[PDB]
Amino acid sequence: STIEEQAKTFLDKFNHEAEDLFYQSSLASWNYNTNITEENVQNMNNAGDKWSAFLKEQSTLAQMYPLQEIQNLTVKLQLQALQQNGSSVLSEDKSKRLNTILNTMSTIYSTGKVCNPDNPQECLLLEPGLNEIMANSLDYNERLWAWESWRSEVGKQLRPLYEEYVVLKNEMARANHYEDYGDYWRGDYEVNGVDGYDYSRGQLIEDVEHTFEEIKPLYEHLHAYVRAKLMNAYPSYISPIGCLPAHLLGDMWGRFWTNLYSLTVPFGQKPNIDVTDAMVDQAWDAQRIFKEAEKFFVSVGLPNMTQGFWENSMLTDPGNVQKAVCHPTAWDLGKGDFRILMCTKVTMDDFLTAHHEMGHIQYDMAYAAQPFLLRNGANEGFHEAVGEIMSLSAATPKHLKSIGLLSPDFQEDNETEINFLLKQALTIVGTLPFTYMLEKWRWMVFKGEIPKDQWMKKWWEMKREIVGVVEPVPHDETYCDPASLFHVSNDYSFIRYYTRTLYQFQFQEALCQAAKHEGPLHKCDISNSTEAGQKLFNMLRLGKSEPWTLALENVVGAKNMNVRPLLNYFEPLFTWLKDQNKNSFVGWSTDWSP
Amino acid sequence: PNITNLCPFDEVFNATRFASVYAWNRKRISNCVADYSVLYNLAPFFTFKCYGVSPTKLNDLCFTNVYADSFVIRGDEVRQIAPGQTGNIADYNYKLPDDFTGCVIAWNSNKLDSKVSGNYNYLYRLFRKSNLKPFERDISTEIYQAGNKPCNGVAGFNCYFPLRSYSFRPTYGVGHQPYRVVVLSFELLHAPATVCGPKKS
Ligand SMILES: *[C@@H]1O[C@H](CO)[C@@H](O)[C@H](O)[C@H]1NC(C)=O
Ligand SMILES: *[C@@H]1O[C@H](CO)[C@@H](O)[C@H](O)[C@H]1NC(C)=O
Ligand SMILES: *[C@@H]1O[C@H](CO)[C@@H](O)[C@H](O)[C@H]1NC(C)=O
Ligand SMILES: *[C@@H]1O[C@H](CO)[C@@H](O)[C@H](O)[C@H]1NC(C)=O
Ligand SMILES: *[C@@H]1O[C@H](CO)[C@@H](O)[C@H](O)[C@H]1NC(C)=O
């Protein structure tokens, strides 16, 4: 026939072989993660080499079939995904240069150490010592000392190294007919071939900035409220009209706002909900936690999870005989194998993370019927949101009342709603602008349209005019401050956080409106609603065979990102702030200078 | 009937090593012990699917000529054995006519086939010509020409090897564990008719 049947049979053979090899490599990786040995490291290297060689050979084999005369869609999508060789276009010299430069990134971050002069022989690493000296203190002198010292010797080492990295990335983009590496990152949101569902690589920046422009007033008001709280608390150092310097944000680089919760609560006398006391007084363990989690999931409507998990799981750390990392993760193995690796501790956040990982496993289990290539989410944002839906839903006091943990003696009023919404707002609206800022910065620096010799000055100005944070001390052009983050050093996409935050609220509104659970938005319980589960699964089954817009249409009915659910969630808190903080100064002055 | 004139036809339900799917093993039964109520009482066997005639009244009609069939497949395709479904195995490895009258038995082999290193001794045909005839066996491994083009059975491109290899392991979940399958069929009245069992009047 034509090349259509050729592509079909080749894809069948590739599906089989890739399935087998991927299963081998993933099982080896799981075995290493459970128990760490040097021979396991050698096995890791061998499996990685085999997978890389197989992918290279199969991509070179697939490059024969052109995409011009293919009329199907799934076959075209698979061929488009597979045909892209990746880094093979570059010569071996620059290929190994890139490998070594990523190795330098990993070494300077993981093994990067700034050591206290008090104990030069036994001191703290980037974690957890820096975090506990930056977010668990009151004196400002050591705070500013650490703030200056962290980049006093780390930023210097990487600026020429980062320049080499960015020029090599520009060559990488040029080799594959891409305008910039930012286009390479944005390509995950690109879909073509469908009329009315077309999404280009340009509209993303415009609609993201439009959403941020819509959300700006709430963030401004919350920042003004926190600044007023700081002035009423500790005015001896910060000028009453000046902006908020970053070193007072608790985190070393200024990412989250949760750790300021000790100096933000308006309702100090009101006790926040804490189920840990009843959790320990009733002898709760990980097994019962996951049992009730799967009971909740089957209450929603999704099927019970595999039995082979239970006899092939590691939930409780088996003493100290063997040493292994217990960082909570959900592993997809293939061939009907899914696993969870986490060390169970008795705390509410562990409960929420257990729900999160169970949701992740559910989403992974959903699209097992799809072929091997199409076994992924519609984009890089669906996983986190579809996992965090249950985490957001299970934190309501109504759910705790229903499950039987909290005593029904607790009354529900406006005060608890205000406290809960304050916590959630500090979690969300404090990290949305930072994410947008970092992603936009990396976007126009990888496009290469901006000059070179005053990057720090421009970056500080455009931070001050947007996020309203002023530097404590001037920085020269040799510094490389935005490289202190883990993600920027290891080439990770940072835009998935904005998308996750918007999409989770879209999902919550669209799944509680159909749930007919009348009341406030934050008091929505997904459990005992089979129709909501079916509505979720009618899209959660697709995977990535269809455009992400078609996916978002099937559960929400909207074709893009919208801020309205997010504004609806914070409606009570927004009303409280507007009614109470009218007498306080709002906004950041544009004339302040340190 | 006597019947202590046993014949070794119960070994196919309790064996040591099953064959592949392309070389499915065909057997003839005559003048034997026709005991079949014992088979229904065997708990470990799980999938008891009959389509031709009545299962509980399978012993009612005397079996003049009996054919037994044995092979092993993957967990998902036990549903594809039922007549009227197309795809792999059902069209490239083994065929069952719609008018076929008989029964099919399937059971688990999790602990009798697994291996920590992965079992690769079971193969299956993935490519074939237009179709295999019902109740026919194909063994030859002639290099499959693919579609068109002058690729005269060499290697590598376009042309593909028809017989691929399975992989079975202990850590697999339900849906990838090996399933041992046997088939029972019969035909009527040609050469002086031989066997039927517990017609307990
Ligand atoms: C983990 O590895 C150590 C060292 O190789 C060994 O002594 C121990 O038995 C292993 N444990 C398991 C469960 O494999
Ligand atoms: C694409 O191929 C698949 C193969 O099963 C088929 O189901 C589908 O209908 C085809 N679609 C088009 C548009 O050719
Ligand atoms: C199947 O789901 C039910 C809840 O509907 C649950 O109790 C049961 O444990 C699940 N099956 C297995 C094998 O866990
Ligand atoms: C959900 O249904 C179960 C079944 O009786 C019930 O025990 C539980 O209280 C219900 N929860 C909610 C929030 O309706
Ligand atoms: C083979 O195993 C089955 C399992 O039920 C048993 O009924 C049968 O008697 C066994 N075969 C022999 C020859 O004992």
mmCIF file of C-alpha atoms in Angstrom, chain A residues 1 6 9-10 12-13 16-17 19-20 23-24 27 61 64-65 312 335-337, chain B residues 88 120 124 126-127 146-148 157-158 160 164-165 167 169 171-174 176:
data_model
loop_
_atom_site.group_PDB
_atom_site.id
_atom_site.type_symbol
_atom_site.label_atom_id
_atom_site.label_comp_id
_atom_site.label_asym_id
_atom_site.label_seq_id
_atom_site.Cartn_x
_atom_site.Cartn_y
_atom_site.Cartn_z
ATOM 1 C CA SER A 1 0.000 0.000 0.000
ATOM 2 C CA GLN A 6 4.090 0.815 6.833
ATOM 3 C CA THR A 9 3.228 -1.908 11.448
ATOM 4 C CA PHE A 10 6.395 -0.020 12.410
ATOM 5 C CA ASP A 12 3.251 -1.737 16.433
ATOM 6 C CA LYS A 13 6.771 -3.183 16.553
ATOM 7 C CA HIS A 16 6.159 -3.760 21.784
ATOM 8 C CA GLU A 17 9.929 -3.264 21.999
ATOM 9 C CA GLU A 19 7.256 -1.348 26.297
ATOM 10 C CA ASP A 20 9.618 -4.196 27.160
ATOM 11 C CA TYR A 23 9.655 -1.892 31.870
ATOM 12 C CA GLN A 24 13.151 -3.316 32.347
ATOM 13 C CA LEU A 27 11.962 -1.926 37.401
ATOM 14 C CA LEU A 61 14.600 4.530 11.633
ATOM 15 C CA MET A 64 12.237 7.892 6.885
ATOM 16 C CA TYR A 65 8.458 8.368 6.688
ATOM 17 C CA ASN A 312 4.402 -4.890 46.344
ATOM 18 C CA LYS A 335 2.399 -3.896 32.438
ATOM 19 C CA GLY A 336 -0.116 -3.370 35.232
ATOM 20 C CA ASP A 337 2.392 -2.220 37.864
ATOM 21 C CA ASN B 88 -4.179 -10.083 16.907
ATOM 22 C CA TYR B 120 11.429 -15.391 26.861
ATOM 23 C CA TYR B 124 3.798 -15.500 18.925
ATOM 24 C CA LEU B 126 2.700 -10.807 14.841
ATOM 25 C CA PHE B 127 2.616 -10.579 11.028
ATOM 26 C CA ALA B 146 5.694 -5.462 4.021
ATOM 27 C CA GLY B 147 3.214 -3.880 1.634
ATOM 28 C CA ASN B 148 5.294 -3.243 -1.479
ATOM 29 C CA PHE B 157 13.881 -1.969 6.942
ATOM 30 C CA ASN B 158 10.277 -2.367 5.799
ATOM 31 C CA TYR B 160 9.898 -7.492 9.527
ATOM 32 C CA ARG B 164 8.027 -11.990 18.243
ATOM 33 C CA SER B 165 8.821 -13.035 21.807
ATOM 34 C CA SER B 167 8.012 -11.676 28.361
ATOM 35 C CA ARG B 169 7.685 -12.037 35.183
ATOM 36 C CA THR B 171 5.955 -8.558 39.323
ATOM 37 C CA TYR B 172 3.439 -8.175 36.482
ATOM 38 C CA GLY B 173 -0.124 -7.263 37.386
ATOM 39 C CA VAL B 174 -3.384 -8.755 36.190
ATOM 40 C CA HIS B 176 -0.031 -9.405 31.647
#
